[PDB]
Amino acid sequence: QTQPRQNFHVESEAGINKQINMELYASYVYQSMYMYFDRDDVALPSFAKYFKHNSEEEREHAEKLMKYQNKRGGRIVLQDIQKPDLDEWGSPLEAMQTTLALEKSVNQALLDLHKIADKHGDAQMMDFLEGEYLKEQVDAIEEISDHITNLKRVGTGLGEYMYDKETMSS
Amino acid sequence: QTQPRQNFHVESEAGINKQINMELYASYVYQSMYMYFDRDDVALPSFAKYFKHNSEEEREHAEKLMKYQNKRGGRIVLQDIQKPDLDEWGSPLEAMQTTLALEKSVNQALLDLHKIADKHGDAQMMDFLEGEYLKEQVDAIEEISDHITNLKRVGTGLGEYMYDKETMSS
Amino acid sequence: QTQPRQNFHVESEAGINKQINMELYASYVYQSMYMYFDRDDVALPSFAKYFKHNSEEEREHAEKLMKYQNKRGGRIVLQDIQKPDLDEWGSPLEAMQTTLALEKSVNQALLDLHKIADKHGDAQMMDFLEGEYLKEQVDAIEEISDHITNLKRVGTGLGEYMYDKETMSS
Amino acid sequence: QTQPRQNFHVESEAGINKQINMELYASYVYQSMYMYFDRDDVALPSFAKYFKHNSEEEREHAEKLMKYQNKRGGRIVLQDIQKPDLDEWGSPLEAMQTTLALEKSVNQALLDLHKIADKHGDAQMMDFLEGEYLKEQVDAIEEISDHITNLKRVGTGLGEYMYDKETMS
Ligand SMILES: [Fe+3]
Ligand SMILES: [Fe+3]
Ligand SMILES: [Fe+3]
Ligand SMILES: [Fe+3]
Ligand SMILES: [Fe+3]
Ligand code: NA
Ligand code: NA
Ligand code: NA
Ligand code: NA
C-alpha cells in the first residue's frame, strides 16, 4: 500500500475519482452559464458573475477531493470533462431550474459516496464529506430554490433586470 | 519635409485629417443626444450624463489624433463639423440603436485608416491606432449592444426609468 | 449577424473556439501535475503550488478568450476537455520538459490563430492576441527553459528539494 | 449513576481510559525522540523541537479525553505510562518511520474506540472523536508520510541538515 493508507477502501478511492469528475463537470456547466449570461443578447452581468462564482466554487470542490484522495493515500485518475448538455440556457428562470437539477444530481452522488464510506467503516471520510460537501449542497439547493421562487414572482422583463441588480448583485 | 517626418505618408496624413473631423462629428451627435435627454419632456438625467461623457470622450479622441498628426510631422486641416442628422432622438432604445450605428461607422473608418497605415508600412501608426482607438471601439460596441438588449428587456415606461437609475447611473 | 459583429470572420470565431478548448486542456494538464506533486511519495509542495497557479492562469486564459468571443459577437461552443496524456509525470525535470512542450504547442496554436486574424484583416483581434497571449507565451517558455536548465544543474535528490525551497517558493 | 451520565456506556468509558493511556504513551515516545535529537552527537535542533511540539500535542490529546470522560460522567482511571521501546532512535528517516507506525497505531486505536461509541449509539461521542481526533490523525499521517519521502529524497548528511533548517524549522 501507499504509506498513508489506513482504513481506506478501494471502493471509496474509486468513488472519489468518480466524484472528482462530477465536480469538474458541474464547474464546466456553470462556466458555460456564466458566458451565456455574458452574451450581447442576454446581457445580465450579475447573473453572469453568480455562475462565474459557482463555477470557481465547483472547481474548488473538485480540488479538495483530489487533495483528500492524496491525503488518504489513494491515486487520482482523471477522465475527460464532458461538455455541458446545452450551448445556451434560456431564461434566468430556466437556467436556475437547470442548476437546481444539477445540484440535486451532485448531492445524490455525494450521498452515494457517503454510503460507500459508511459501508467500509470509513468514519473520517464520512465526517469529511458531511462537513465539506453535504452541508454546502443543502445550502446551495436552498439558495437556488429561493432564486426560482423569486424569478417566478417577478416575471419576465423588468423583473429579470431588477433581480440582477438587487438579489444577484454583491 | 517637416522636421519630425519619417515613414509618414501623405495618404496617412490626409486620412488622419478625415478621421479628426469624424471624431468631432461623433462628439457633436452625442452632445445633441445629451441635451435631448435633458429636455423637460424627456428628463432622463443619467442617460443625459452618459451621452455628455461620451461626447467628451469623442472630443478627446479627436484631439489625440490632432496631437498624433503634429507628432509625426503632418499638418492639421480642419473642416466644418456637420450638424447631427436629427434634432431629437426618440426613445432610449432608439437613441442607443442610433449610437450603435454611429460607433460602427467610426470603427469602420478607423479600420480603413489602419489599412492606410498598413499599406505604407507605418508600423508605429498601426500600433497607435490599435491601442488608442480600435480597442476602445470594440469596447464601446460591446457596451452599447448590452444597453440595447437590456432596454428591450425592461420595455418602455418604468423600465426606462429604472434603467436610468440603475445601469446608467455612475 | 449578432449586434456587435464587425470585421469578425467566421474562421476567426471558429479558431477562438478551438483555442478555448486548448487552454482548458492545458489547465487540466497543470492541475494533474499539481496533484501529482501533492502525492505522499513525491511531496514537493512548492512544485505543486507552481503547477496549481499555472492551472489557474490557463483557466483564466480560456475565460478571457470566451469573453473576447462574446465581445466580438461570436458564439462560444464548448467541447469535451480531454484528460491529460499521463496520470503521473516523473521527476521535476521530466515534468518541466513536458511543460515546455505543452507551452510550445499552445504558442504555435496561438500564432496559428493570429495568422487567421491576419488573413482576414482583423486588426483588433491581432492586437488582442499579441498583448494578452503571445507576450505571456514567450515569458512562460523563458521561465520553463530556465527551470529545466537549473534542474539539470542541481541534479536529483537534495538538488530537487533545494530547488523546491528556493526557486519554486514564493 | 453520576449526575451527567446519559447515553454513555461502560464500554465507551473503559475505552476512553485505555485511549488516555495510549495518548500519554505517545507523548512519552515523542519526548524521548525530542531529547534524542538534542544529544550532542545528533544535534538537529529543529527535529528536536518538532518532536517536542508533537509530545506536547499528544499530552493535550490525552487531557482532552480526560476532560471528555468527566464531561460525560465517566471516571478517569490512570495506569502506568510505559517507557518507549527504545532509548535512541537512529537517523531522521528511521525516527520518522517509527513515528508513522506510532501514529497509525494510535489512529487504529481511535477507530476502534469510535467503533465502540457506534455500537452503543453514542452519537455525541462519535462526533467528538471525528472532529477532535480522527481528522488530526489523517493530517498527522499525511505530514509524516511527506517527511519520510523528503528524507529519502535528500539522503543522509547535508540533506538531513538542510531538511532541519528548511522544512523542520
Ligand atoms: Fe460541488
Ligand atoms: Fe471616437
Ligand atoms: Fe494559456
Ligand atoms: Fe494523539
Ligand atoms: Fe458526524
Ligand atoms: Na458581454
Ligand atoms: Na433638463
Ligand atoms: Na500531499
Ligand atoms: Na543539545
Residue numbers in the entry:
A (entry chain C), B (entry chain F), C (entry chain J): 3 to 172
D (entry chain B): 3 to 171
The paper states:
Accordingly, ferritin plays a central role in taking up iron (as Fe2+) and storing it in a stable and unreactive form (as Fe3+-oxide/hydroxide).
In this study, the crystal structure of TgFer was solved by molecular replacement and contained a dodecamer in the asymmetric unit. The final model was refined at a resolution of 1.78 Å and featured a visible electron density for residues 3–171 of each subunit, resulting in an Rwork of 0.20 and an Rfree of 0.23. In the crystal structures of TgFer and TgFer + Fe, only site A of the ferroxidase center was occupied by Fe-1, but no clear electron density indicative of a metal ligand was visible around site B, similar to the structural features of Marsupenaeus japonicus ferritin (MjFer). In TgFer, the hydrophilic channel penetrating along the 3-fold symmetry channel is considered to represent one potential Fe2+ ion entry channel to the ferritin cavity. Electrostatic potential calculations showed that the outer entrance to the 3-fold channel is conspicuously surrounded by negative potential values across the whole region, which extend across the protein shell to the inner entry.
